[PDB]
Enzyme design. Structure first.
Site, PDB file in Angstrom:
ATOM      1  N   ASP A  91     -34.289 -71.084   2.861  1.00 50.47           N
ATOM      2  CA  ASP A  91     -35.463 -70.360   2.776  1.00 50.47           C
ATOM      3  C   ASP A  91     -36.647 -70.747   1.725  1.00 50.47           C
ATOM      4  O   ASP A  91     -36.029 -71.277   0.746  1.00 50.47           O
ATOM      5  CB  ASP A  91     -35.182 -68.823   2.805  1.00 50.47           C
ATOM      6  CG  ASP A  91     -36.120 -67.988   3.111  1.00 50.47           C
ATOM      7  OD1 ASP A  91     -37.212 -68.513   3.692  1.00 50.47           O
ATOM      8  OD2 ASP A  91     -36.178 -66.700   2.792  1.00 50.47           O
ATOM      9  N   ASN A 146     -37.270 -66.405  14.809  1.00 49.74           N
ATOM     10  CA  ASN A 146     -38.251 -67.334  14.421  1.00 49.74           C
ATOM     11  C   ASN A 146     -39.164 -67.858  15.803  1.00 49.74           C
ATOM     12  O   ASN A 146     -40.375 -68.373  15.441  1.00 49.74           O
ATOM     13  CB  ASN A 146     -37.638 -68.606  13.942  1.00 49.74           C
ATOM     14  CG  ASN A 146     -37.005 -68.527  12.554  1.00 49.74           C
ATOM     15  OD1 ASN A 146     -36.065 -69.028  12.057  1.00 49.74           O
ATOM     16  ND2 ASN A 146     -37.561 -67.671  11.564  1.00 49.74           N
ATOM     17  N   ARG A 154     -42.597 -67.111  15.450  1.00 52.47           N
ATOM     18  CA  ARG A 154     -43.741 -67.560  14.820  1.00 52.47           C
ATOM     19  C   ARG A 154     -44.892 -68.343  15.741  1.00 52.47           C
ATOM     20  O   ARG A 154     -44.746 -68.365  16.914  1.00 52.47           O
ATOM     21  CB  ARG A 154     -43.130 -68.644  13.992  1.00 52.47           C
ATOM     22  CG  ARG A 154     -42.240 -68.024  12.741  1.00 52.47           C
ATOM     23  CD  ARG A 154     -41.711 -69.268  11.973  1.00 52.47           C
ATOM     24  NE  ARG A 154     -40.842 -68.355  10.889  1.00 52.47           N
ATOM     25  CZ  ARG A 154     -40.376 -69.140   9.632  1.00 52.47           C
ATOM     26  NH1 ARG A 154     -40.629 -70.211   9.571  1.00 52.47           N
ATOM     27  NH2 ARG A 154     -39.731 -68.234   8.976  1.00 52.47           N
ATOM     28  N   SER A 163     -30.798 -61.643   6.530  1.00 48.75           N
ATOM     29  CA  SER A 163     -31.627 -61.783   7.904  1.00 48.75           C
ATOM     30  C   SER A 163     -30.806 -62.244   9.119  1.00 48.75           C
ATOM     31  O   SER A 163     -30.927 -63.358   9.831  1.00 48.75           O
ATOM     32  CB  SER A 163     -32.848 -62.967   7.745  1.00 48.75           C
ATOM     33  OG  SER A 163     -33.584 -62.349   6.460  1.00 48.75           O
ATOM     34  N   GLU A 216     -19.596 -62.061  -0.657  1.00 46.66           N
ATOM     35  CA  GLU A 216     -20.337 -61.840  -1.775  1.00 46.66           C
ATOM     36  C   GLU A 216     -21.699 -62.439  -1.692  1.00 46.66           C
ATOM     37  O   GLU A 216     -21.686 -63.643  -1.252  1.00 46.66           O
ATOM     38  CB  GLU A 216     -19.576 -62.612  -2.826  1.00 46.66           C
ATOM     39  CG  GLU A 216     -20.380 -62.439  -4.159  1.00 46.66           C
ATOM     40  CD  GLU A 216     -20.054 -62.978  -5.449  1.00 46.66           C
ATOM     41  OE1 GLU A 216     -18.918 -63.238  -5.623  1.00 46.66           O
ATOM     42  OE2 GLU A 216     -20.653 -62.900  -6.723  1.00 46.66           O
ATOM     43  N   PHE A 238      -9.706 -54.692  -5.981  1.00 49.39           N
ATOM     44  CA  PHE A 238      -8.701 -53.979  -5.270  1.00 49.39           C
ATOM     45  C   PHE A 238      -8.951 -54.187  -3.782  1.00 49.39           C
ATOM     46  O   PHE A 238      -9.881 -53.858  -3.250  1.00 49.39           O
ATOM     47  CB  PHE A 238      -8.673 -52.413  -5.614  1.00 49.39           C
ATOM     48  CG  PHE A 238      -7.645 -52.121  -4.949  1.00 49.39           C
ATOM     49  CD1 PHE A 238      -6.185 -51.856  -5.388  1.00 49.39           C
ATOM     50  CD2 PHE A 238      -7.598 -51.261  -3.650  1.00 49.39           C
ATOM     51  CE1 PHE A 238      -5.121 -51.535  -4.798  1.00 49.39           C
ATOM     52  CE2 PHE A 238      -6.463 -50.854  -2.868  1.00 49.39           C
ATOM     53  CZ  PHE A 238      -5.364 -50.816  -3.198  1.00 49.39           C
TER      54      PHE A 238
END
Ligand SMILES: CC(C)=CCC/C(C)=C/CSP(=O)(O)OP(=O)(O)O
Ligand SMILES: CC(C)=CCC/C(C)=C/CSP(=O)(O)OP(=O)(O)O
Ligand SMILES: C=C(C)CCSP(=O)(O)OP(=O)(O)O
Ligand SMILES: [Cl-]
Ligand SMILES: [Mg+2]
Ligand SMILES: [Mg+2]
Lengths: 285, 285
Positions: free
Chosen positions: B65, B113, B116, B241, B252, B282
């Site tokens: 991005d 997209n 656009r 997104s 993560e 945990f």
């Protein structure tokens, strides 16, 4: 338009009084029209920030993380942290009403939590049952609409039924909706929508070729839940951990370091001010 | 063990030299066994950090991005930034190999997209076609297995075709797998799996009550893709997104502020060092 409640009088009831556990929610002045009561202000007496309606998140999702860690750091049993987190739920509901948030999803028990010790799981089941039972009348008085979101296998019948009573009692409220997510997992929720779609196909009520993204959305457990605009998680962990998985595909993430038992409505407001400074494009431009 | 490639000889070829476009990928010495070539080192000659294999992410997903803003800040047309992003793709592939990453998913065009302008959509479709044509021989020589992930409706046939050739020519490679995600949308991917499941039900080959989360996973377009461990997004936006929606449920997130055309393999390594250092909670896998 600025949909925050006007600031509270200096002598309006505050919350929370942590001198007892469970916390006793204050008596509130009766509402003039007879509608919802104005929530108690925070004990700091801070006022909600003025955020215009077109920059406020409609739907905030919160992963309430850091309860056990908070307790262990203090040499207390992990369950004491969860106990302290109850008042924080109610404080954040009050602050969300003060700010003008219309939808709040709270991750109260993940499907992952079946990996915990069965003693801690029993505590967490009973505690969520007890929180709903203890707070349902306060929530009703504040204009909260609350209901269960989650998966059935293994979840205590008493928890489902306690939330069903709260849902029936608050069904007509409209100040804010709380999705109280217990035994919830986003992949599991999608899977159950796919099962329901499959049952309709098997019965001849649905042509497979007519399935779209909206078909999935309409077959989720609670198809009235809007997309998540702002996704919060405490304790510094930067994971969504399968929470509101379908609904949060375009959410803004604001990961905050405070542990949940230390969190208060001012921290929610700070994240919402940060959200309001951001630009969302949803794949356009 | 420590699966990094050791530092390259000082005179080993470097990459990228962004002083020309398309960027030149250097000739590389033949590999002894006749296998994959060692990737060129970065222009800085930095070497990958020593991260033990048990602490590395198995699968890194990257939302590439900030290309348009990179160009607009320089008074250039938005799509000049996308042109600079091509070299970054190849640099990051080289760095992922040096670090030992086995799976890399790259978000090159989303199902949103299409919102656009027709001009920008035409550019982005043709550019992705052209990137794959220009770079698939290089990727093959490095031992990359590359293939398309995405939705077929609306996607230009030229893009699918170039990726199909790349997929066939690299299907036996095993240094790293790159999912090159074009017209990808996580909700759409799940919808298409649900459609396939529904077709099996309608045909009497699948019972609704035997559908599990694994059934959905097995019916995604590319069911060999493992969970995302580490989800990266450049340009300062803190959102997923709709990328890798099912697969990144437990990932993560690391949000990096650099714009994609300014990114290089050392930034990927820094994020992987952060991931490797994080205490694992945990119950986590
Ligand atoms: C505080 C309330 C009402 C619900 C949240 C309870 C809950 C199951 C949180 C999950 S994460 P937690 O147990 O808090 O994580 P740790 O810091 O103990 O590692
Ligand atoms: C670098 C390659 C091969 C493809 C680029 C993929 C792509 C369209 C990435 C999004 S950058 P974009 O959203 O267009 O730029 P900003 O408006 O966010 O600055
Ligand atoms: C990298 C991509 C090909 C798509 C995701 S980045 P995009 O700019 O679309 O994401 P938003 O900021 O939500 O609009
Ligand atoms: Cl660890
Ligand atoms: Mg987008
Ligand atoms: Mg963008």
């Amino acid at each position: 338009n600025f949909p925050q409640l006007p600031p509270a009088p200096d002598d309006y009831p505050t919350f929370p009084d942590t001198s007892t556990w469970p916390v006793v929610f204050p008596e509130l002045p009766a509402a003039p029209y007879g509608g919802p009561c104005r929530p108690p202000q925070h004990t700091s007496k801070a006022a909600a920030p003025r955020i215009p309606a077109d920059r406020l998140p409609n739907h905030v999702a919160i992963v309430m993380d850091g309860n056990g860690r908070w307790a262990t750091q203090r040499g207390l049993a992990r369950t004491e942290g969860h106990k302290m987190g109850e008042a924080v739920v109610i404080d954040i509901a009050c602050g969300a009403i003060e700010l003008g948030i219309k939808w709040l999803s709270l991750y109260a028990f993940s499907t992952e939590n079946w990996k915990r010790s069965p003693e801690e799981v029993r505590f967490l089941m009973g505690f969520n049952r007890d929180v709903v039972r203890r707070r349902r009348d306060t929530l009703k008085k504040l204009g909260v609409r609350i209901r269960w979101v989650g998966s059935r296998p293994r979840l205590w019948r008493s928890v489902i039924n306690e939330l069903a009573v709260a849902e029936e009692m608050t069904k007509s409220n409209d100040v804010i909706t709380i999705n109280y997510c217990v035994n919830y997992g986003g992949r599991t929720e999608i899977t159950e929508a796919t099962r329901e779609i499959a049952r309709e196909v098997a019965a001849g009520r649905l042509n497979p070729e007519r399935i779209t993204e909206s078909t999935i959305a309409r077959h989720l457990q609670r198809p009235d839940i809007p997309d998540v605009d702002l996704f919060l998680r405490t304790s510094g962990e930067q994971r969504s951990s399968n929470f509101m998985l379908w609904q949060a595909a375009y959410a803004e993430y604001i990961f905050q370091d405070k542990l949940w038992p230390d969190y208060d409505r001012r921290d929610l407001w700070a994240a919402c001010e940060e959200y309001a400074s951001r630009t969302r494009r949803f794949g356009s431009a």
